[PDB]
Amino acid sequence: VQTKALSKATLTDLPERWENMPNLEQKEIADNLTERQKLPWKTLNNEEIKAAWYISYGEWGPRRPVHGKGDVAFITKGVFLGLGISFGLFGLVRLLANPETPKTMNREWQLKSDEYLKSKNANPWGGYSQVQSK
């Protein structure tokens, strides 16, 4: 009967209020709740039980999650952006390599080069056709 209950405006909406409260008010309502818990428990109002549970066990400070508030979306955006950036830079590094190809790279050489293979039945059951060019 000695300690006073916390009023409604000091303690309303506390899981939506704990992050931007000043560090001088947080110690005050922490002291007030940890002395309100020394009463019989049934006379603790249902507004402050949620407050005590969020203060002692909420997802703030030490219990903050490592993937918080859509950062899985940020990291998959970063992964696909990195894949696109590396693809584009590989393309414009590939652009400056060498003008001419080895002459046996186009399809016209490849048709003769596997006609020669089927003349001598090389790779008879597996694959023997070599084209790989457009």
Binding site: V131, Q132, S133, K134
Partner: protein, 45 residues
Amino acid sequence: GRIGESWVITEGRRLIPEIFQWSAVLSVCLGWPGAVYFFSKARKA
């Protein structure tokens, strides 16, 4: 256990949806050579 839904059902419900996503992640951690072969000109694309 003794009283409740049986352990066979309550762990089959937990693990039977896990087998298909395991097969998905293994079929795309070892099966992307098939996906890169599928679009190339060797498959008469």
